Design a protein around this ligand. Structure first.
Ligand SMILES: CO[C@@H]1O[C@@H](C)[C@@H](O)[C@@H](O)[C@@H]1O
Ligand SMILES: CO[C@@H]1O[C@@H](C)[C@@H](O)[C@@H](O)[C@@H]1O
Ligand SMILES: CO[C@@H]1O[C@@H](C)[C@@H](O)[C@@H](O)[C@@H]1O
Ligand SMILES: CO[C@@H]1O[C@@H](C)[C@@H](O)[C@@H](O)[C@@H]1O
Ligand SMILES: [Ca+2]
Ligand SMILES: [Ca+2]
Ligand SMILES: [Ca+2]
Ligand SMILES: [Ca+2]
Ligand SMILES: [Ca+2]
Ligand SMILES: [Ca+2]
Ligand SMILES: [Ca+2]
Ligand SMILES: [Ca+2]
Lengths: 114, 114, 114, 114
């Protein structure tokens, strides 16, 4: 199945934060309604934050996360969880190799903000 | 029900990251096996990161998040989600007032690292 | 926080299924747009299905689960999870006593159908 | 990523329930520590329950769900959600055709029981 794609409510501010846990340098691409709006590039084997930004979901609400290492697309896993029918988390893990820890880049999307 | 309490595998490193979205200064206490190991204090209405640390779950694996604003306990909501039977997110939201956005402090715990 | 309340897309068919794990007879009330549309009454200490029905979320999309045992409201826990940005689960546990297993009535809501 | 594989606590009773939403007849295979312990076969386009059993997780706690239609493996999506650090749901969807609704067989695993 496709992973890393989420439908947010329209015109909503959201946070996106990425962490790295790999020998490989991670590139996280964030798209909103099919346009790249953020890029995080970094490397850590100890969960360093490689980016955190506030974005708007726009008219369409479509948010897509892609992860690559040296140009190779990482395999993604994702889900959305809603707490108290209002607090949302869109969650991504990614795997750049074959150990299947799925933490090589970890991406957390959160809304609402403010 | 009690919220903000999670059982991690023993002696395992985990990331804890807190975000703020409130007029109130947030205090996030992180306890491992019933002892405070970290406290994050900060203020933001724009999802600023008020703390991010790597911690160890210790022998018992018990991790508890408590949130307060000027000595008043916030109401917590939480859940744990596991992707691909391997990547874990323990998620906390909190409410310090009456609008019920539950984002006033948001805490994300992730494991494994590395 | 309020638990057991979920916002579904309007005019959408959904499944609701309840399981019992308690000495006490469970009465699960399902409200759609603030009107009772199903009542499941049963008893089991071994996960018997006490109801499974197809319902419609109607104009407003509001679904609420309440559980009582001998007329006393059980404490609820809940969350929603979405897989592949499409497959939805709204999940409820309930506690009728002091052992905090939260499984005394378990309620699973799933959509879409068909 | 591999989907439909879950680690339960050892030697633990759990519920497994399968629902169908497809023109295709669903065959759901349940394995405990790499051996089949149940098979559910049925058809519905209205969320009928095609199986519900109580099973034991065995010494290793490994539970796997596989779904096929007329011998063809369905694509799976899955996650586990834990409420109140106690109440567990392991969730599977599956897709047998081209519409990507992932509901064609839906499997819910719940524990603890009792
Ligand atoms: C080469 O493998 C990459 O780096 C290692 C240090 C591990 O983090 C592994 O999960 C990652 O996929
Ligand atoms: C006074 O209320 C607090 O501050 C506001 C600016 C909002 O973030 C609200 O959610 C928060 O509870
Ligand atoms: C009296 O307590 C009720 O029945 C027992 C058999 C247990 O299922 C317990 O969780 C439940 O709350
Ligand atoms: C042929 O397609 C199968 O049957 C249809 C009635 C739908 O349920 C579709 O999701 C399913 O994959
Ligand atoms: Ca890896
Ligand atoms: Ca890694
Ligand atoms: Ca608030
Ligand atoms: Ca707020
Ligand atoms: Ca109980
Ligand atoms: Ca019980
Ligand atoms: Ca389908
Ligand atoms: Ca279908």
């Amino acid at each position: 199945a496709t992973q890393g794609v989420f439908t947010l409510p329209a015109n909503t501010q959201f946070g996106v934060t990425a962490f790295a846990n790999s020998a490989g340098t991670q590139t996280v691409n964030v798209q909103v309604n099919n346009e790249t709006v953020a890029t995080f590039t970094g490397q850590s084997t100890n969960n360093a934050i490689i980016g955190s930004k506030v974005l708007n979901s726009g008219g369409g609400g479509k948010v897509q996360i892609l992860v690559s290492v040296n140009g190779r697309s990482s395999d993604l896993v994702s889900a959305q969880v809603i707490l108290a029918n209002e607090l949302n988390f869109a969650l991504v893990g990614s795997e750049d190799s074959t150990d299947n820890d799925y933490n090589d880049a970890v991406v957390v999307i959160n809304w609402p903000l403010g």
